[PDB]
Amino acid sequence: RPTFYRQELNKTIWEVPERYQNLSPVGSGAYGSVCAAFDTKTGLRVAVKKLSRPFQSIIHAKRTYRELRLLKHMKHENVIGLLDVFTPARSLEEFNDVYLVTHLMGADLNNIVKCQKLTDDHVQFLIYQILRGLKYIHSADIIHRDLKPSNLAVNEDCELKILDFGLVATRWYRAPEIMLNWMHYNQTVDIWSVGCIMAELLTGRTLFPGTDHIDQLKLILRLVGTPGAELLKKISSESARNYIQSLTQMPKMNFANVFIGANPLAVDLLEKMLVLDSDKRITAAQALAHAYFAQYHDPDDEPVADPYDQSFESRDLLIDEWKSLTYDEVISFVPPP
Ligand SMILES: CNC(=O)c1ccc(C)c(-n2c(C)cc(OCc3ccc(F)cc3F)c(Br)c2=O)c1
Ligand SMILES: Fc1ccc(-c2c[nH]nc2-c2ccnc(F)c2)cc1
Numbered sequence: 565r566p567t568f569y570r571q572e573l574n575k576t577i578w579e580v581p582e583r584y585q586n587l588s589p590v591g592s593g594a595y596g597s598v599c600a601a602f603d604t605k606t607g608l609r610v611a612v613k614k615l616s617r618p619f620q621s622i623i624h625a626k627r628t629y630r631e632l633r634l635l636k637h638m639k640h641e642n643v644i645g646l647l648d649v650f651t652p653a654r655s656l657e658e659f660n661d662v663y664l665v666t667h668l669m670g671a672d673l674n675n676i677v678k679c680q681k682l683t684d685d686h687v688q689f690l691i692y693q694i695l696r697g698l699k700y701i702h703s704a705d706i707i708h709r710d711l712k713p714s715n716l717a718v719n720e721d722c723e724l725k726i727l728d729f730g731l732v733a734t735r736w737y738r739a740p741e742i743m744l745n746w747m748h749y750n751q752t753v754d755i756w757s758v759g760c761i762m763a764e765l766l767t768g769r770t771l772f773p774g775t776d777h778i779d780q781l782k783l784i785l786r787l788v789g790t791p792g793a794e795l796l797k798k799i800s801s802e803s804a805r806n807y808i809q810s811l812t813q814m815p816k817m818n819f820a821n822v823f824i825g826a827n828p829l830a831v832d833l834l835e836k837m838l839v840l841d842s843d844k845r846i847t848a849a850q851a852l853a854h855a856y857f858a859q860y861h862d863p864d865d866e867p868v869a870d871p872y873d874q875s876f877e878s879r880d881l882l883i884d885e886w887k888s889l890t891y892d893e894v895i896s897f898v899p900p901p
Contacts, residue, residue: 568652573599576614579652580663584612595627600668609668610647618662625886627731628662629876632893634730635664637704637872642697644717644725649897656891669725673713674732677765684827686722687765692860693724694758698848702751704869706730711757712737713764735777736770737761740784741842743777744804752845759837766826782811788840789816795841829856
């Protein structure tokens with residue numbers, strides 16, 4: 565076992581192996597705190613995440629397991645992966661803290677959209693990278709569900725990775741079918757979010773700044789139109805249909821006019837991503853092949869993920885069982901060497 569050393573950072577205690585030095589808090593992100601650090605073994609700058617109350621309840625214990633499982637699975641340049649996972653506990657009975665370690669990126673897409681206004685060329689490269697990561701995640705039967713600029717980490721190299729998959733005001737990037745509470749949504753939920761993000765990078769403003777679920781829907785429908793007959797036929801919920809069909813009908817706007825000065829390829833991709841009916845929305849793989857990404861696209865360099873066992877998601881287990889499963893996964897971890 566390595567030697568651990570202990571310190572307090574913003575009320576939080578951190579017990580990490582001596583290999584990680586100069587810890588510096590870089591913010592709380594719900595369910596955990598993050599420090600930047602220097603990894604003496606690799607020479608790399610890393611982010612270390614301490615999970616908050618990983619075993620507080622069955623929900624938390626299952627969530628801790630899920631995140632560790634997801635992170636051990638993801639091995640892709642545009643998806644956050646694991647350099648290390650550790651606990652200061654020397655046995656299962658002593659196990660109550662999980663630390664997760666990844667390459668430090670040091671910014672997010674908000675930190676890039678803000679005050680700086682990106683060229684079409686930067687937009688192509690950033691969105692290419694999101695789609696490249698999404699192709700991979702989607703190939704493992706994983707849906708992000710909460711893609712937004714603050715979940716997209718970007719380094720000084722303009723290299724991007726998706727954070728917080730499978731687990732700043734999130735509702736602005738949410739697919740309309742989720743605002744309506746549909747339980748059978750598909751992976752193109754994430755493509756909607758990409759469309760909202762891409763629009764924001766092109767225009768410098770939030771495409772749909774909703775104040776609540778209902779206001780969000782209204783803003784979406786003014787751009788994309790109220791549902792046509794084919795989509796209306798697909799809504800089971802009487803309450804949902806009463807509401808939608810009770811709104812004043814709106815036509816789909818002309819995207820070429822809304823995004824007036826943008827690359828006409830960017831506009832074309834936007835309208836394929838922001839299709840109301842999720843069954844008609846472009847997939848991540850299809851989007852990568854869109855002419856907008858001509859300068860970046862290579863099918864031989866856009867890998868798919870190994871099979872991911874999500875069967876645990878259906879299981880109703882005790883806290884101690886989720887805890888022991890998580891311990892097993894910490895101990896079996898094999899670093900990228
Ligand atoms: C405030 N300045 C920063 O250094 C700064 C600014 C913005 C961001 C998104 C970040 N930042 C954050 C928060 C988390 C982060 O990774 C979290 C994280 C995920 C998985 C894991 F196994 C270990 C981790 F730790 C990275 Br990687 C990162 O880069 C840092
Ligand atoms: F106002 C609306 C109406 C429908 C959607 C929608 C988009 N894609 N799929 C749906 C959908 C399909 C089946 N049942 C639902 F409830 C929703 C979104 C907003």
